[PDB]
Symmetry: D5
Protein backbone atom coordinates (compact mmCIF):
# COMPACT_ATOMS: atom_id res chain seq x y z
CA UNK A 1 0.00 0.00 0.00
CA UNK A 2 1.25 3.55 -0.70
CA UNK A 3 3.20 5.26 2.09
CA UNK A 4 0.70 8.06 2.66
CA UNK A 5 -1.77 5.46 3.94
CA UNK A 6 0.29 5.42 7.13
CA UNK A 7 -0.24 9.14 7.80
CA UNK A 8 -2.74 10.09 10.51
CA UNK A 9 -5.77 12.13 9.36
CA UNK A 10 -5.42 15.87 8.90
CA UNK A 11 -8.46 18.09 9.43
CA UNK A 12 -6.60 21.19 8.31
CA UNK A 13 -7.10 24.89 9.19
CA UNK A 14 -10.45 25.44 7.53
CA UNK A 15 -13.78 25.59 9.27
CA UNK A 16 -16.12 23.27 7.38
CA UNK A 17 -17.01 19.95 8.99
CA UNK A 18 -17.13 17.35 6.27
CA UNK A 19 -16.68 13.65 6.70
CA UNK A 20 -13.86 11.95 4.85
CA UNK A 21 -12.19 8.56 5.12
CA UNK A 22 -8.66 7.71 6.03
CA UNK A 23 -6.81 4.44 6.28
CA UNK A 24 -6.18 3.52 9.86
CA UNK A 25 -3.15 1.26 9.60
CA UNK A 26 -3.47 0.11 13.25
CA UNK A 27 -6.99 -1.15 12.72
CA UNK A 28 -6.31 -2.09 9.09
CA UNK A 29 -9.54 -0.33 8.16
CA UNK A 30 -10.64 2.96 6.63
CA UNK A 31 -12.48 5.12 9.12
CA UNK A 32 -14.12 8.50 9.07
CA UNK A 33 -12.71 11.81 10.28
CA UNK A 34 -13.78 15.45 10.03
CA UNK A 35 -12.04 17.35 7.26
CA UNK A 36 -12.09 21.15 7.42
CA UNK A 37 -12.42 21.85 3.73
CA UNK A 38 -8.88 22.83 2.81
CA UNK A 39 -5.19 21.87 2.78
CA UNK A 40 -5.92 18.14 2.63
CA UNK A 41 -3.16 15.60 2.87
CA UNK A 42 -3.01 12.31 0.87
CA UNK A 43 -4.67 10.04 3.39
CA UNK A 44 -8.05 11.73 2.80
CA UNK A 45 -10.71 10.07 0.65
CA UNK A 46 -14.07 11.40 -0.32
CA UNK A 47 -15.22 7.87 -1.09
CA UNK A 48 -14.80 4.88 1.24
CA UNK A 49 -14.47 2.58 -1.74
CA UNK A 50 -11.46 4.52 -3.00
CA UNK A 51 -9.97 4.43 0.46
CA UNK A 52 -10.06 0.66 0.82
CA UNK A 53 -8.86 0.09 -2.72
CA UNK A 54 -5.92 2.47 -2.55
CA UNK A 55 -4.87 1.68 0.99
CA UNK A 56 -6.56 -1.58 1.88
Amino acid sequence: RPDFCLEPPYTGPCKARIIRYFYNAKAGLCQTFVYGGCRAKRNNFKSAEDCMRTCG
Copy 2:
Protein backbone atom coordinates in the same frame (compact mmCIF):
# COMPACT_ATOMS: atom_id res chain seq x y z
CA ARG B 1 -29.37 -9.98 14.21
CA PRO B 2 -25.77 -9.07 15.13
CA ASP B 3 -25.13 -8.14 18.75
CA PHE B 4 -23.94 -4.58 17.98
CA CYS B 5 -27.47 -3.81 16.83
CA LEU B 6 -28.32 -3.65 20.51
CA GLU B 7 -25.79 -0.90 21.34
CA PRO B 8 -27.18 2.60 21.75
CA PRO B 9 -26.03 5.24 19.23
CA TYR B 10 -22.66 6.85 19.78
CA THR B 11 -22.14 10.42 18.52
CA GLY B 12 -18.47 10.42 19.41
CA PRO B 13 -16.03 13.26 20.31
CA CYS B 14 -16.00 14.98 16.93
CA LYS B 15 -17.82 18.16 16.03
CA ALA B 16 -19.59 17.51 12.75
CA ARG B 17 -23.32 16.99 12.80
CA ILE B 18 -24.07 14.24 10.33
CA ILE B 19 -27.21 12.14 10.32
CA ARG B 20 -26.77 8.40 10.51
CA TYR B 21 -29.03 5.48 11.28
CA PHE B 22 -28.92 3.10 14.19
CA TYR B 23 -31.10 0.14 15.09
CA ASN B 24 -33.43 0.89 17.96
CA ALA B 25 -34.01 -2.50 19.49
CA LYS B 26 -36.85 -1.24 21.70
CA ALA B 27 -38.70 0.25 18.75
CA GLY B 28 -37.53 -2.53 16.41
CA LEU B 29 -36.79 0.13 13.82
CA CYS B 30 -33.78 2.04 12.54
CA GLN B 31 -33.83 5.69 13.43
CA THR B 32 -31.61 8.67 12.91
CA PHE B 33 -29.06 10.22 15.19
CA VAL B 34 -26.38 12.87 14.88
CA TYR B 35 -22.89 11.47 14.36
CA GLY B 36 -19.96 13.73 15.09
CA GLY B 37 -17.77 12.41 12.31
CA CYS B 38 -15.24 10.28 14.13
CA ARG B 39 -14.71 7.18 16.31
CA ALA B 40 -17.89 5.49 15.17
CA LYS B 41 -19.23 2.34 16.76
CA ARG B 42 -20.84 -0.57 14.91
CA ASN B 43 -24.49 0.45 15.27
CA ASN B 44 -23.98 3.35 12.83
CA PHE B 45 -25.12 3.13 9.24
CA LYS B 46 -24.74 5.74 6.54
CA SER B 47 -27.64 4.14 4.67
CA ALA B 48 -31.06 3.37 6.13
CA GLU B 49 -31.35 0.36 3.82
CA ASP B 50 -28.17 -1.23 5.20
CA CYS B 51 -29.38 -0.61 8.75
CA MET B 52 -32.63 -2.50 8.40
CA ARG B 53 -31.02 -5.27 6.41
CA THR B 54 -28.16 -5.84 8.90
CA CYS B 55 -30.15 -5.24 12.07
CA GLY B 56 -33.80 -5.57 11.11
Copy 3:
Protein backbone atom coordinates in the same frame (compact mmCIF):
# COMPACT_ATOMS: atom_id res chain seq x y z
CA ARG C 1 -17.65 -10.44 12.05
CA PRO C 2 -21.22 -11.62 11.39
CA ASP C 3 -21.47 -14.93 9.50
CA PHE C 4 -23.32 -13.47 6.47
CA CYS C 5 -20.08 -11.62 5.70
CA LEU C 6 -18.81 -14.94 4.41
CA GLU C 7 -21.60 -15.39 1.85
CA PRO C 8 -20.68 -14.71 -1.74
CA PRO C 9 -22.53 -11.84 -3.45
CA TYR C 10 -26.02 -12.45 -4.81
CA THR C 11 -27.21 -10.44 -7.82
CA GLY C 12 -30.75 -11.83 -7.61
CA PRO C 13 -33.35 -12.37 -10.35
CA CYS C 14 -34.08 -8.73 -11.07
CA LYS C 15 -32.89 -6.78 -14.08
CA ALA C 16 -31.52 -3.51 -12.76
CA ARG C 17 -27.71 -3.14 -12.71
CA ILE C 18 -26.85 -1.32 -9.48
CA ILE C 19 -23.50 -1.32 -7.78
CA ARG C 20 -23.38 -2.60 -4.22
CA TYR C 21 -20.62 -3.69 -1.87
CA PHE C 22 -20.01 -7.10 -0.38
CA TYR C 23 -17.35 -8.34 2.00
CA ASN C 24 -14.88 -10.56 0.23
CA ALA C 25 -13.54 -12.72 3.03
CA LYS C 26 -10.71 -14.14 0.87
CA ALA C 27 -9.42 -10.64 0.11
CA GLY C 28 -10.50 -9.30 3.49
CA LEU C 29 -11.88 -6.24 1.75
CA CYS C 30 -15.26 -5.01 0.61
CA GLN C 31 -15.65 -4.95 -3.16
CA THR C 32 -18.33 -4.06 -5.67
CA PHE C 33 -20.77 -6.26 -7.48
CA VAL C 34 -23.81 -5.71 -9.61
CA TYR C 35 -27.09 -6.08 -7.74
CA GLY C 36 -30.27 -6.73 -9.74
CA GLY C 37 -32.59 -4.71 -7.60
CA CYS C 38 -34.47 -7.37 -5.67
CA ARG C 39 -34.21 -10.38 -3.39
CA ALA C 40 -31.04 -9.10 -1.74
CA LYS C 41 -29.06 -11.21 0.71
CA ARG C 42 -27.32 -9.91 3.82
CA ASN C 43 -23.85 -9.50 2.34
CA ASN C 44 -25.05 -6.52 0.27
CA PHE C 45 -24.31 -2.91 1.31
CA LYS C 46 -25.44 0.23 -0.40
CA SER C 47 -22.62 2.07 1.37
CA ALA C 48 -18.99 0.96 1.38
CA GLU C 49 -18.61 2.49 4.82
CA ASP C 50 -21.28 0.25 6.30
CA CYS C 51 -19.69 -2.75 4.60
CA MET C 52 -16.29 -2.40 6.17
CA ARG C 53 -17.78 -1.48 9.57
CA THR C 54 -20.17 -4.41 9.73
CA CYS C 55 -17.85 -7.01 8.12
CA GLY C 56 -14.32 -5.60 8.25
Copy 4:
Protein backbone atom coordinates in the same frame (compact mmCIF):
# COMPACT_ATOMS: atom_id res chain seq x y z
CA ARG D 1 -49.64 1.76 9.49
CA PRO D 2 -51.42 3.22 6.42
CA ASP D 3 -53.36 0.75 4.32
CA PHE D 4 -51.25 1.19 1.19
CA CYS D 5 -48.35 -0.36 3.10
CA LEU D 6 -50.02 -3.70 2.46
CA GLU D 7 -50.04 -3.35 -1.36
CA PRO D 8 -47.45 -5.39 -3.25
CA PRO D 9 -44.86 -3.34 -5.22
CA TYR D 10 -45.81 -1.97 -8.61
CA THR D 11 -43.08 -1.61 -11.25
CA GLY D 12 -45.40 0.09 -13.72
CA PRO D 13 -45.43 0.19 -17.56
CA CYS D 14 -42.33 2.34 -17.98
CA LYS D 15 -38.86 1.16 -19.04
CA ALA D 16 -36.43 2.67 -16.55
CA ARG D 17 -34.95 0.39 -13.89
CA ILE D 18 -34.75 2.38 -10.70
CA ILE D 19 -34.51 1.03 -7.19
CA ARG D 20 -37.28 1.93 -4.80
CA TYR D 21 -38.44 0.70 -1.42
CA PHE D 22 -41.75 -0.90 -0.52
CA TYR D 23 -43.08 -2.21 2.78
CA ASN D 24 -43.19 -5.98 2.77
CA ALA D 25 -45.87 -6.72 5.36
CA LYS D 26 -45.05 -10.44 5.52
CA ALA D 27 -41.42 -9.67 6.35
CA GLY D 28 -42.33 -6.55 8.31
CA LEU D 29 -39.44 -4.81 6.59
CA CYS D 30 -38.97 -2.41 3.73
CA GLN D 31 -37.25 -4.00 0.77
CA THR D 32 -36.13 -2.94 -2.68
CA PHE D 33 -37.84 -3.42 -6.00
CA VAL D 34 -37.35 -2.15 -9.54
CA TYR D 35 -39.58 0.82 -10.41
CA GLY D 36 -40.16 1.54 -14.09
CA GLY D 37 -40.23 5.30 -13.78
CA CYS D 38 -43.96 5.98 -14.13
CA ARG D 39 -47.47 5.32 -12.76
CA ALA D 40 -46.25 4.67 -9.24
CA LYS D 41 -48.52 3.38 -6.51
CA ARG D 42 -48.44 4.45 -2.82
CA ASN D 43 -46.20 1.66 -1.54
CA ASN D 44 -43.15 3.13 -3.32
CA PHE D 45 -40.56 5.15 -1.47
CA LYS D 46 -37.51 6.83 -2.90
CA SER D 47 -35.90 6.85 0.55
CA ALA D 48 -35.62 3.77 2.77
CA GLU D 49 -35.93 5.99 5.84
CA ASP D 50 -39.33 7.30 4.68
CA CYS D 51 -40.54 3.75 4.03
CA MET D 52 -39.88 2.43 7.50
CA ARG D 53 -41.20 5.59 9.15
CA THR D 54 -44.43 5.63 7.14
CA CYS D 55 -45.07 1.89 7.09
CA GLY D 56 -42.87 0.45 9.83
Copy 5:
Protein backbone atom coordinates in the same frame (compact mmCIF):
# COMPACT_ATOMS: atom_id res chain seq x y z
CA ARG E 1 -54.42 10.86 3.32
CA PRO E 2 -52.89 9.41 6.54
CA ASP E 3 -53.69 11.26 9.75
CA PHE E 4 -50.07 12.10 10.52
CA CYS E 5 -50.09 14.31 7.41
CA LEU E 6 -51.98 16.80 9.57
CA GLU E 7 -49.34 17.06 12.28
CA PRO E 8 -47.22 20.20 12.21
CA PRO E 9 -43.46 19.75 11.61
CA TYR E 10 -41.26 18.67 14.54
CA THR E 11 -37.60 19.72 14.52
CA GLY E 12 -36.85 17.69 17.61
CA PRO E 13 -34.22 18.16 20.34
CA CYS E 14 -31.16 17.46 18.22
CA LYS E 15 -28.73 20.02 16.89
CA ALA E 16 -28.18 19.24 13.21
CA ARG E 17 -29.91 21.44 10.67
CA ILE E 18 -31.16 19.16 7.93
CA ILE E 19 -33.86 19.99 5.43
CA ARG E 20 -36.87 17.68 5.37
CA TYR E 21 -40.32 17.95 3.89
CA PHE E 22 -43.66 17.91 5.67
CA TYR E 23 -47.22 18.08 4.40
CA ASN E 24 -48.75 21.47 5.02
CA ALA E 25 -52.47 20.68 5.06
CA LYS E 26 -53.45 24.38 5.03
CA ALA E 27 -51.44 24.95 1.89
CA GLY E 28 -52.14 21.44 0.57
CA LEU E 29 -48.50 21.18 -0.41
CA CYS E 30 -45.31 19.69 1.01
CA GLN E 31 -42.85 22.25 2.21
CA THR E 32 -39.46 22.26 3.85
CA PHE E 33 -38.49 22.57 7.49
CA VAL E 34 -35.31 22.16 9.52
CA TYR E 35 -35.02 18.75 11.17
CA GLY E 36 -32.64 18.46 14.11
CA GLY E 37 -31.46 14.95 13.41
CA CYS E 38 -33.33 12.90 15.98
CA ARG E 39 -36.71 11.98 17.47
CA ALA E 40 -38.55 12.49 14.16
CA LYS E 41 -42.32 12.36 13.88
CA ARG E 42 -44.32 10.80 11.05
CA ASN E 43 -44.84 14.01 9.06
CA ASN E 44 -41.15 14.13 8.07
CA PHE E 45 -39.98 13.03 4.62
CA LYS E 46 -36.42 12.87 3.40
CA SER E 47 -37.70 12.94 -0.18
CA ALA E 48 -40.23 15.44 -1.50
CA GLU E 49 -41.58 12.86 -3.88
CA ASP E 50 -42.43 10.59 -0.96
CA CYS E 51 -44.14 13.44 0.88
CA MET E 52 -46.56 14.31 -1.91
CA ARG E 53 -47.31 10.69 -2.68
CA THR E 54 -48.01 9.69 0.93
CA CYS E 55 -49.80 12.89 1.97
CA GLY E 56 -50.78 14.60 -1.24
Copy 6:
Protein backbone atom coordinates in the same frame (compact mmCIF):
# COMPACT_ATOMS: atom_id res chain seq x y z
CA ARG F 1 -49.06 28.66 -12.32
CA PRO F 2 -46.91 29.06 -15.47
CA ASP F 3 -48.45 27.86 -18.68
CA PHE F 4 -45.84 25.20 -19.42
CA CYS F 5 -47.16 23.39 -16.34
CA LEU F 6 -50.04 22.24 -18.50
CA GLU F 7 -47.86 20.61 -21.15
CA PRO F 8 -47.75 16.83 -21.00
CA PRO F 9 -44.33 15.17 -20.31
CA TYR F 10 -41.81 14.93 -23.14
CA THR F 11 -39.31 12.04 -23.04
CA GLY F 12 -37.51 13.29 -26.12
CA PRO F 13 -35.49 11.47 -28.81
CA CYS F 14 -32.54 10.44 -26.65
CA LYS F 15 -31.88 6.98 -25.22
CA ALA F 16 -31.13 7.48 -21.52
CA ARG F 17 -33.84 6.55 -19.03
CA ILE F 18 -33.72 9.19 -16.32
CA ILE F 19 -36.48 9.94 -13.85
CA ARG F 20 -37.83 13.47 -13.87
CA TYR F 21 -40.96 15.09 -12.52
CA PHE F 22 -43.69 16.92 -14.38
CA TYR F 23 -46.84 18.67 -13.20
CA ASN F 24 -49.92 16.62 -13.90
CA ALA F 25 -52.60 19.29 -14.07
CA LYS F 26 -55.37 16.65 -14.09
CA ALA F 27 -54.10 15.15 -10.87
CA GLY F 28 -52.85 18.50 -9.59
CA LEU F 29 -49.68 16.76 -8.48
CA CYS F 30 -46.15 16.37 -9.77
CA GLN F 31 -45.39 12.86 -10.95
CA THR F 32 -42.47 11.00 -12.48
CA PHE F 33 -41.72 10.15 -16.07
CA VAL F 34 -38.77 8.84 -18.00
CA TYR F 35 -36.70 11.55 -19.65
CA GLY F 36 -34.43 10.55 -22.51
CA GLY F 37 -31.59 12.87 -21.73
CA CYS F 38 -32.02 15.52 -24.39
CA ARG F 39 -34.33 18.12 -25.96
CA ALA F 40 -36.24 18.66 -22.69
CA LYS F 41 -39.37 20.79 -22.54
CA ARG F 42 -40.30 23.20 -19.74
CA ASN F 43 -42.49 20.79 -17.76
CA ASN F 44 -39.49 18.71 -16.71
CA PHE F 45 -38.01 19.05 -13.22
CA LYS F 46 -34.94 17.30 -11.89
CA SER F 47 -36.16 18.07 -8.35
CA ALA F 48 -39.65 17.23 -7.10
CA GLU F 49 -39.50 20.20 -4.77
CA ASP F 50 -38.94 22.59 -7.72
CA CYS F 51 -41.81 21.02 -9.63
CA MET F 52 -44.39 21.58 -6.91
CA ARG F 53 -43.14 25.07 -6.09
CA THR F 54 -43.06 26.20 -9.75
CA CYS F 55 -46.28 24.48 -10.85
CA GLY F 56 -48.13 23.60 -7.68
Copy 7:
Protein backbone atom coordinates in the same frame (compact mmCIF):
# COMPACT_ATOMS: atom_id res chain seq x y z
CA ARG G 1 -40.05 33.65 -18.37
CA PRO G 2 -42.37 33.45 -15.35
CA ASP G 3 -42.63 36.64 -13.34
CA PHE G 4 -41.27 35.17 -10.08
CA CYS G 5 -37.94 34.87 -11.88
CA LEU G 6 -37.57 38.61 -11.31
CA GLU G 7 -37.88 38.35 -7.51
CA PRO G 8 -34.67 38.73 -5.53
CA PRO G 9 -33.59 35.64 -3.48
CA TYR G 10 -35.28 35.08 -0.14
CA THR G 11 -33.25 33.35 2.59
CA GLY G 12 -36.18 33.16 4.98
CA PRO G 13 -36.35 33.15 8.83
CA CYS G 14 -34.89 29.70 9.36
CA LYS G 15 -31.38 28.82 10.57
CA ALA G 16 -30.05 26.24 8.13
CA ARG G 17 -27.49 27.34 5.52
CA ILE G 18 -28.32 25.48 2.32
CA ILE G 19 -27.27 26.48 -1.16
CA ARG G 20 -30.06 27.15 -3.66
CA TYR G 21 -30.21 28.78 -7.06
CA PHE G 22 -32.15 31.84 -8.10
CA TYR G 23 -32.50 33.61 -11.41
CA ASN G 24 -30.55 36.86 -11.40
CA ALA G 25 -32.40 38.87 -14.04
CA LYS G 26 -29.72 41.56 -14.24
CA ALA G 27 -26.98 39.03 -14.94
CA GLY G 28 -29.38 36.83 -16.91
CA LEU G 29 -27.94 33.79 -15.14
CA CYS G 30 -28.89 31.56 -12.25
CA GLN G 31 -26.66 32.04 -9.25
CA THR G 32 -26.36 30.63 -5.76
CA PHE G 33 -27.68 31.98 -2.48
CA VAL G 34 -28.03 30.67 1.06
CA TYR G 35 -31.53 29.36 1.87
CA GLY G 36 -32.45 29.11 5.54
CA GLY G 37 -34.57 26.00 5.17
CA CYS G 38 -38.14 27.36 5.39
CA ARG G 39 -40.61 29.90 4.03
CA ALA G 40 -39.19 29.68 0.51
CA LYS G 41 -40.31 31.98 -2.32
CA ARG G 42 -40.76 30.96 -5.97
CA ASN G 43 -37.33 32.08 -7.24
CA ASN G 44 -35.62 29.24 -5.35
CA PHE G 45 -34.42 26.11 -7.13
CA LYS G 46 -32.84 23.07 -5.58
CA SER G 47 -31.36 22.16 -8.98
CA ALA G 48 -29.44 24.59 -11.15
CA GLU G 49 -30.78 22.83 -14.25
CA ASP G 50 -34.37 23.57 -13.19
CA CYS G 51 -33.55 27.20 -12.56
CA MET G 52 -32.17 27.88 -16.04
CA ARG G 53 -34.93 25.93 -17.75
CA THR G 54 -37.72 27.63 -15.81
CA CYS G 55 -36.23 31.14 -15.80
CA GLY G 56 -33.53 31.18 -18.46
Copy 8:
Protein backbone atom coordinates in the same frame (compact mmCIF):
# COMPACT_ATOMS: atom_id res chain seq x y z
CA ARG H 1 -16.74 32.89 -22.39
CA PRO H 2 -14.09 30.24 -23.26
CA ASP H 3 -14.05 29.13 -26.88
CA PHE H 4 -14.85 25.51 -26.07
CA CYS H 5 -18.28 26.68 -25.01
CA LEU H 6 -19.02 26.97 -28.71
CA GLU H 7 -18.33 23.29 -29.46
CA PRO H 8 -21.34 21.06 -29.97
CA PRO H 9 -21.83 18.22 -27.45
CA TYR H 10 -19.80 15.06 -27.92
CA THR H 11 -21.26 11.75 -26.68
CA GLY H 12 -18.07 9.85 -27.46
CA PRO H 13 -17.54 6.16 -28.36
CA CYS H 14 -18.47 4.64 -25.01
CA LYS H 15 -21.71 2.89 -24.13
CA ALA H 16 -22.96 4.40 -20.91
CA ARG H 17 -25.88 6.79 -21.03
CA ILE H 18 -25.11 9.56 -18.55
CA ILE H 19 -26.67 13.01 -18.59
CA ARG H 20 -24.28 15.95 -18.80
CA TYR H 21 -24.69 19.63 -19.56
CA PHE H 22 -23.22 21.56 -22.45
CA TYR H 23 -23.46 25.23 -23.37
CA ASN H 24 -25.78 25.80 -26.30
CA ALA H 25 -24.49 29.05 -27.78
CA LYS H 26 -27.52 29.40 -30.09
CA ALA H 27 -29.92 29.14 -27.19
CA GLY H 28 -27.51 30.88 -24.81
CA LEU H 29 -28.35 28.26 -22.22
CA CYS H 30 -26.81 25.09 -20.86
CA GLN H 31 -28.76 22.00 -21.80
CA THR H 32 -28.49 18.30 -21.27
CA PHE H 33 -27.09 15.63 -23.51
CA VAL H 34 -26.23 11.94 -23.17
CA TYR H 35 -22.51 11.31 -22.55
CA GLY H 36 -21.18 7.86 -23.27
CA GLY H 37 -18.70 7.71 -20.43
CA CYS H 38 -15.40 8.26 -22.19
CA ARG H 39 -13.32 10.60 -24.35
CA ALA H 40 -15.14 13.75 -23.22
CA LYS H 41 -14.58 17.10 -24.85
CA ARG H 42 -14.39 20.43 -22.99
CA ASN H 43 -18.02 21.48 -23.44
CA ASN H 44 -19.18 18.77 -21.00
CA PHE H 45 -20.17 19.57 -17.45
CA LYS H 46 -21.20 17.19 -14.71
CA SER H 47 -22.81 20.07 -12.83
CA ALA H 48 -25.32 22.54 -14.37
CA GLU H 49 -24.02 25.25 -12.09
CA ASP H 50 -20.45 24.91 -13.40
CA CYS H 51 -21.80 25.01 -16.98
CA MET H 52 -23.60 28.29 -16.60
CA ARG H 53 -20.73 29.84 -14.66
CA THR H 54 -17.92 28.77 -17.05
CA CYS H 55 -19.85 29.37 -20.27
CA GLY H 56 -22.84 31.55 -19.37
Copy 9:
Protein backbone atom coordinates in the same frame (compact mmCIF):
# COMPACT_ATOMS: atom_id res chain seq x y z
CA ARG I 1 -6.52 27.18 -19.96
CA PRO I 2 -8.94 30.09 -19.38
CA ASP I 3 -7.45 33.03 -17.50
CA PHE I 4 -9.86 32.75 -14.55
CA CYS I 5 -8.09 29.49 -13.66
CA LEU I 6 -5.27 31.66 -12.36
CA GLU I 7 -7.47 33.55 -9.83
CA PRO I 8 -7.11 32.48 -6.22
CA PRO I 9 -10.28 31.04 -4.59
CA TYR I 10 -12.95 33.43 -3.30
CA THR I 11 -15.03 32.32 -0.31
CA GLY I 12 -17.32 35.36 -0.58
CA PRO I 13 -19.32 37.24 2.07
CA CYS I 14 -21.92 34.58 2.76
CA LYS I 15 -21.97 32.28 5.74
CA ALA I 16 -22.50 28.79 4.43
CA ARG I 17 -19.49 26.43 4.50
CA ILE I 18 -19.63 24.39 1.31
CA ILE I 19 -16.74 22.62 -0.34
CA ARG I 20 -15.89 23.64 -3.90
CA TYR I 21 -12.90 23.09 -6.14
CA PHE I 22 -10.57 25.70 -7.62
CA TYR I 23 -7.57 25.32 -9.93
CA ASN I 24 -4.34 25.90 -8.12
CA ALA I 25 -1.99 26.98 -10.84
CA LYS I 26 1.09 26.71 -8.61
CA ALA I 27 0.32 23.06 -7.82
CA GLY I 28 -1.20 22.47 -11.23
CA LEU I 29 -4.04 20.68 -9.55
CA CYS I 30 -7.61 21.37 -8.51
CA GLN I 31 -8.04 21.56 -4.73
CA THR I 32 -10.85 22.21 -2.33
CA PHE I 33 -11.81 25.39 -0.57
CA VAL I 34 -14.70 26.58 1.49
CA TYR I 35 -17.29 28.61 -0.46
CA GLY I 36 -19.68 30.86 1.44
CA GLY I 37 -22.68 30.28 -0.72
CA CYS I 38 -22.83 33.54 -2.65
CA ARG I 39 -20.95 35.95 -4.95
CA ALA I 40 -18.91 33.20 -6.53
CA LYS I 41 -16.05 33.96 -8.90
CA ARG I 42 -15.18 31.89 -11.97
CA ASN I 43 -12.46 29.69 -10.44
CA ASN I 44 -15.11 27.85 -8.38
CA PHE I 45 -16.33 24.36 -9.40
CA LYS I 46 -19.00 22.28 -7.77
CA SER I 47 -17.60 19.17 -9.44
CA ALA I 48 -13.88 18.25 -9.42
CA GLU I 49 -14.21 16.73 -12.86
CA ASP I 50 -15.38 20.04 -14.35
CA CYS I 51 -12.49 21.71 -12.59
CA MET I 52 -9.71 19.68 -14.13
CA ARG I 53 -11.36 19.65 -17.54
CA THR I 54 -11.87 23.38 -17.74
CA CYS I 55 -8.59 24.40 -16.06
CA GLY I 56 -6.32 21.34 -16.15
Copy 10:
Protein backbone atom coordinates in the same frame (compact mmCIF):
# COMPACT_ATOMS: atom_id res chain seq x y z
CA ARG J 1 2.69 8.91 -7.60
CA PRO J 2 1.80 5.25 -6.86
CA ASP J 3 2.63 2.76 -9.61
CA PHE J 4 -0.96 1.73 -10.26
CA CYS J 5 -1.59 5.22 -11.57
CA LEU J 6 0.20 4.11 -14.72
CA GLU J 7 -2.18 1.26 -15.44
CA PRO J 8 -4.74 1.77 -18.18
CA PRO J 9 -8.44 1.67 -17.16
CA TYR J 10 -10.14 -1.67 -16.72
CA THR J 11 -13.87 -1.96 -17.34
CA GLY J 12 -14.00 -5.56 -16.16
CA PRO J 13 -16.35 -8.45 -17.11
CA CYS J 14 -19.46 -7.10 -15.55
CA LYS J 15 -22.40 -5.49 -17.35
CA ALA J 16 -23.19 -2.27 -15.49
CA ARG J 17 -22.13 1.01 -17.09
CA ILE J 18 -20.91 3.31 -14.37
CA ILE J 19 -18.53 6.20 -14.74
CA ARG J 20 -15.29 6.15 -12.82
CA TYR J 21 -12.07 8.11 -13.00
CA PHE J 22 -8.61 6.91 -13.86
CA TYR J 23 -5.30 8.71 -14.03
CA ASN J 24 -4.17 9.18 -17.60
CA ALA J 25 -0.43 9.45 -17.24
CA LYS J 26 -0.01 10.59 -20.88
CA ALA J 27 -2.39 13.51 -20.42
CA GLY J 28 -1.39 13.99 -16.77
CA LEU J 29 -5.02 14.26 -15.86
CA CYS J 30 -7.75 12.05 -14.48
CA GLN J 31 -10.45 11.20 -16.99
CA THR J 32 -13.59 9.19 -17.05
CA PHE J 33 -14.15 5.61 -18.20
CA VAL J 34 -16.97 3.09 -18.06
CA TYR J 35 -16.63 0.56 -15.25
CA GLY J 36 -18.58 -2.66 -15.45
CA GLY J 37 -19.36 -3.03 -11.77
CA CYS J 38 -16.88 -5.71 -10.71
CA ARG J 39 -13.28 -6.89 -10.69
CA ALA J 40 -11.92 -3.33 -10.45
CA LYS J 41 -8.22 -2.59 -10.64
CA ARG J 42 -6.39 0.09 -8.60
CA ASN J 43 -6.51 2.89 -11.13
CA ASN J 44 -10.30 3.27 -10.64
CA PHE J 45 -11.71 6.08 -8.49
CA LYS J 46 -15.29 6.73 -7.67
CA SER J 47 -14.41 10.38 -6.92
CA ALA J 48 -12.42 12.66 -9.20
CA GLU J 49 -11.02 14.43 -6.16
CA ASP J 50 -9.52 11.20 -4.85
CA CYS J 51 -8.12 10.48 -8.30
CA MET J 52 -6.17 13.71 -8.63
CA ARG J 53 -4.96 13.56 -5.05
CA THR J 54 -3.77 9.98 -5.18
CA CYS J 55 -2.32 10.09 -8.66
CA GLY J 56 -1.94 13.74 -9.59
